[PDB]
Structure formats: C-alpha cells, structure tokens
C-alpha cells in the first residue's frame, strides 16, 4: 500500500490540477497534497456563468491540434461538451481604420498575389515590393541553421511594411508579443521547412495552402477545472495556503505555510516563476530573473441583441501604432454559439509588453478607455447592459530565442541544488493550456523514473 513518501504540488491552476491527475495514476503508492494560495482552483481559467451566459474571463479556448488537452477532456468525461469556434470575417485595425484580413495569404504571407493585392492595408508601393520580394527572392538569402528571431527571419524575405502592418499583429493576436524577439523554430518551424523544400518562402507557403482551429467547452473552461478536482480520488487540496518557504529536512523538505509545515520528498512548483526564484535561494536562476512578463485585462461588455452588429465578423486585432487602448476585441456571440445566445457580447483585451499601465488602473478608468475605443471604432455610442472586468497580472512571459535551452539549464540547476524539486507551467514549455498540461505530464513522468 502507501509509501512513506510524499509529493506536494504547489499551485492549483490547470498545470497543478493536471499534475495531480497524472500523479494519481503514475504513483498509486505516493501521497499527494496540493497547495493553492487563493480562495479557488483554476488560476487564470475562470468562466462567468450567470443568467444563461458562459463567458470566459481568461483563456477562451485551445488549439485543437494540441490534442493532449482533448484527450484529458475525454478521459474525464467532458468530450460531449466540446465545441469549435465559428469562423467568418476578422479584421486589422490600424490608424487608417478597420481592414479585413487580406485574402490569399497563409499566416499573413501571400500565396495568391492577385487576391492579396486587393488589400487596403498596405500602399500600392508596399504591395509591389511584397510581390517583387516573393517572386524574385534574393540569392543572398540563406535558410537559418541556428534559431533566429521571427522578425529577423521574415523582414529580409517579406519587407518591413508587411511584417509591421500585418504579420506581427496577426500572429501575436491577444498575446501581443514582439515579432522581433520570438523564436522562429519554436513558433513557426514549418515556414523554414517549407522554404527549404520549395526553395523560396512564397512557394513554401504555397505548399501549405488549404469549424475553426480552436476548442472550448459548452459548459465553460472552468468546468474542466471543476471536473479535474472532482475526479481526484486521494489528493488533498488545500486552498488559501500559500507556500512561503522551502527548507531542508535531511534529504526531504519542510514547506512553510501560514498553518504549519508540510513535509515533502517531491515538490512540483507550478506557481509564477519569480516566486520560484525567491523560494529557491541556493539555486542560481538568472534565466528566470530575466524572463519578463506583461499584464492583461479582459473587459467584456454585454449588450441587448443588436440590429446593427458592432463588428461585422468574429473580431479584430489592433496595430500597436494606432491611437487605442485595446489590443484586440472579439464578438464573443459570433465566435461561440454557446456563450451568449440572445445578446451581443464584446470582449476587449488591454495590455502589451512595456505598455500595460491601464491594467493597474481602476475599473472605471479601464472601462472608460475600452468604451471610448469601441465607440470610435464602431461609429456610435454604445450602452452596455453589463461589464465584466478580469485582470491577469504578469500573465504572459516573453519567450525569446534560446528559451527551451535556458529552461533545461534552470531545471538542472534546481535538481542539483534541490534534488526532488521539479518545475512546470506556462514559464517553461509553452504558454498555452495544452502546453501546460504537457508540462505537468512530462514532469510527473520524470518523477516516475526517479522512483
């Protein structure tokens, strides 16, 4: 039966709850305790579910192709609630107004020049320049052997205008990252693979030429959190119990909390990475000290069903140069059939790296900024019936070239200074829900080798 040894999982978001699920199965004889600092499980995942609404406060969905989360959802009995996103028309907002996303393009890279050059997003001259670059690529281009930033890869092939006006805001989406720092190999390795096969970027994207790509749940993403807790059979969940310190107990660890210590043999930290650095002072973790973040607010406005749709499609992304506080907005009721059946619901995002001060301001200042933006964008006065504001402090890390190797080195240092302490979550192996689930599964698995 039960071993003397104990696993403590720290953080009750998706990474920590997934970790407990997988730990229950991998180690029938190991004791499992989960410490969550706040009043609830779920971390960033939270769903507003009153008055027949199902409106996401944090992540709204996940990439279906990352099927580990689909598999978890099925295994725990939630498969029947899976819904896909509707596709219709999306837009880029810049200083020149609301432009439809150009047709004839894969990830903003033109594959049909005639259709693409109908766009108003670039000037005629910029369009001619994109065409000349695509059809007549320089012999001086070289396929990158080592990883380089996306912007360094893309700018010489496509020019600055297309990268700035279309690709960056398209590919960054609600996350708002900087195209010029993100890794090429870790984000879009198929660009390079296809270029190498087709001999040019334009013909590489043409190999890739063609119900949306995303999954959520009818009962809301928070129902996933709730079901995970429910299917745990022996893990002890302690809410309102932040981990405050880690000390050595002759090979084991003493974990300090407000209500007395927990003793552990294995510790999985799934909490924000700057708390990792502070909790593990004998570990030299500059990689984690230099991993930056920004904060995001979501501001959701519920309107009585509208005769003139405020946005004529699923939503828009905003060019960072334009005079707006919002970085993106979604017509939730257009994108998700289940969320708000008899209403018009808009969800705006606010916050970029190096520019997120609005997120720390009051609800009235945040709301007013979002309202002004939309009233200008939509042409008219808008009178929301209800507003739901959520704030995801330090929520998005900026992964740059060499991240994955830096995280390997962080993990080796932690294992060498604190044997039995493992890390998982959004700082490490990908920001998205499925990446975090995988992060949890792989770290649980690797404890399995070490017993």
Ligand X SMILES: Cc1cc2nc3c(=O)[nH]c(=O)nc-3n(C[C@H](O)[C@H](O)[C@H](O)COP(=O)(O)OP(=O)(O)OC[C@H]3O[C@@H](n4cnc5c(N)ncnc54)[C@H](O)[C@@H]3O)c2cc1C
Stretch touching ligand X by CB under 6 A, among 54-62, 93-101, 281-289, 372-380: 54-62
Which residue's CB is nearer to ligand X, number 243 or number 444?
243
Burial category of 283 from C-beta neighbours within 10 Å (exposed 0-12, middle 13-18, buried 19 and up): middle
The answer to the question of residue 436 lying near ligand X (CB under 6 A) is yes
Query: In sequence order, which residues have a C-beta less than 8 Å from that of residue 60 and are 6 or more positions away?
Result: 214, 216, 221, 330, 332, 335, 336, 347
Buried b (16+ CB within 10 A) or exposed e, 424-440: bbbbbbbbbbbbbbbbb
| From candidates 27, 57, 59, 266, binder to ligand X by CB under 6 A | 59
**Least distance from ligand X to the Cβ atom of residue 196, Å:** 29
275: annotated binding-site residue? yes
The answer to the question of residue 425 lying near ligand X (CB under 6 A) is yes
Which residue's CB is nearer to ligand X, number 36 or number 147?
36
Stretch touching ligand X by CB under 6 A, among 186-194, 333-341, 355-363, 392-400: 392-400
| From candidates 433, 438, 444, 447, binder to ligand X by CB under 6 A | 433
Contact 215, 227 (CB under 8 A): no
Write the DSSP string, 275-338. Answer: HHHHH-TTS--HHHHT--EEEEEEEEEEEE--SS-SSSSSEEEE-TTSS-SEEEEEEHHHH-TT
114: annotated binding-site residue? no
367: annotated binding-site residue? no
243: annotated binding-site residue? yes
Please count the residues of this chain forming the interface with ligand X, following the rule CB under 6 A: 36
Number of residue whose CB is nearest ligand X: 43
Taking residues 262 to 291 in sequence order and writing x for each that binds ligand X by CB under 6 A, - otherwise, the string is: --------xxx--x----------------
What is residue 406's three-state secondary structure? helix
Query: In sequence order, which residues have a C-beta less than 8 Å from that of residue 330 and are 6 or more positions away?
Result: 60, 314, 315, 346, 347
Write the DSSP string, 226-247. Answer: HHHHHH-SSPEEESS----EEE
Write the DSSP string, 127-186. Answer: HHHHHHHHHS--TT----SS--BHHHHHHHHH-HHHIIIIIHHHHHGGG---TTTSBSTT
Structure token digits, residue 96: 């020149």
| From candidates 431, 438, 443, 447, binder to ligand X by CB under 6 A | 431
Structure token digits, residue 264: 């552990």
Stretch touching ligand X by CB under 6 A, among 103-111, 136-144, 153-161, 388-396: 388-396
Paired residues of 316 in beta bridges: 91, 329
For ligand X, the binding residues in 9-48 under the rule CB under 6 A are 10-16, 35-38, 43-45
Contact 228, 77 (CB under 8 A): no
293: annotated binding-site residue? no
Tell me 259's DSSP state: T
| From candidates 6, 60, 90, 287, binder to ligand X by CB under 6 A | 60
**Least distance from ligand X to the Cβ atom of residue 376, Å:** 23
426: annotated binding-site residue? yes
The answer to the question of residue 220 lying near ligand X (CB under 6 A) is no
Residue with structure tokens 């981990």? 243
| From candidates 392, 407, 421, 438, binder to ligand X by CB under 6 A | 392
For ligand X, the binding residues in 294-313 under the rule CB under 6 A are 296
Which residue's CB is nearer to ligand X, number 11 or number 353?
11
Which residue's CB is nearer to ligand X, number 45 or number 340?
45
Phi-psi region of 290 (alpha: psi -120 to 50; beta: other; left: phi over 0): alpha
The answer to the question of residue 382 lying near ligand X (CB under 6 A) is no
44: annotated binding-site residue? yes
Known binding-site residues for FAD equal 15, 36, 44, 60-61, 243, 275, 426, 431, 433, 436
Give contact residues for ligand X (rule: CB under 6 A).
10-16, 35-38, 43-45, 58-62, 174, 242-243, 270-272, 275, 296, 392, 395-396, 425-426, 431-433, 436
């Amino acid at each position: 039966g039960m071993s003397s040894k104990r696993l403590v999982i720290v953080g009750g978001g998706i990474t920590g709850l997934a970790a407990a699920y997988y730990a229950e199965r991998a180690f029938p004889d190991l004791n499992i305790t989960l410490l969550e600092a706040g009043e609830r499980l779920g971390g960033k995942v939270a769903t507003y579910r009153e008055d027949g609404f199902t409106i996401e406060r944090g992540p709204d969905s996940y990439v279906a192709r990352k099927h580990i989360l689909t598999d978890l959802i099925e295994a725990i009995g939630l498969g029947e609630k899976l819904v896909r996103n509707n596709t219709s028309q999306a837009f880029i907002l810049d200083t020149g107004g609301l432009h439809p996303i150009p047709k004839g393009a894969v990830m903003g890279i033109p594959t049909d020049l005639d259709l693409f050059r109908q766009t108003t997003l670039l000037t005629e001259e910029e369009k001619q320049e994109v065409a000349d670059l695509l059809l007549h690529p320089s012999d001086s281009l070289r396929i990158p052997e080592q990883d380089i930033p996306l912007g360094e890869y893309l700018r010489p092939r496509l020019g600055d205008a297309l990268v700035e006006k279309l690709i960056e805001p398209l590919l960054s989406g609600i996350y708002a990252g900087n195209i010029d720092q993100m890794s090429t190999f870790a984000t879009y390795p198929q660009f390079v693979a296809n270029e190498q096969k087709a001999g040019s970027l334009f013909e590489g994207m043409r190999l890739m030429r063609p119900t949306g790509q995303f999954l959520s749940l009818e009962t809301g993403l928070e129902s996933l959190i709730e079901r995970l807790e429910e299917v745990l059979e022996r893990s002890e969940i302690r809410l309102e119990t932040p981990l405050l310190a880690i000390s050595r107990e002759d090979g084991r660890y003493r974990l300090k909390t407000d209500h007395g210590p927990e003793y552990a043999d294995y510790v999985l930290l799934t909490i924000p990475h700057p708390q990792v650095v502070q909790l593990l002072p004998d570990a030299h973790l500059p990689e984690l000290e230099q991993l930056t973040t920004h904060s995001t607010a979501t501001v959701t406005m519920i309107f009585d069903q509208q005769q003139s749709l405020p946005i004529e499609g699923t939503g828009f992304v905003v060019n960072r140069r334009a005079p707006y506080s919002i970085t993106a907005c979604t017509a939730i009721d257009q994108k998700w059939n289940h969320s708000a059946p008899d209403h018009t619901v808009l969800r705006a995002f606010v916050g970029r790296p190096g520019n997120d001060h609005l997120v720390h301001e009051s609800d009235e200042v945040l709301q007013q900024a979002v309202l002004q933006d939309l009233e200008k964008i939509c042409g008219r006065t808008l009178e929301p019936k209800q507003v739901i504001i959520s704030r995801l402090m330090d929520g998005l890390p900026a992964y740059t070239v060499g991240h994955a190797d830096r995280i390997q080195r962080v993990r080796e240092e932690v294992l060498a200074q604190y044997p039995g302490i493992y890390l998982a979550g959004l700082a490490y192996d990908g920001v998205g829900l499925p990446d975090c689930v995988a992060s949890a599964k792989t770290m649980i698995e690797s404890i399995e080798l070490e017993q």
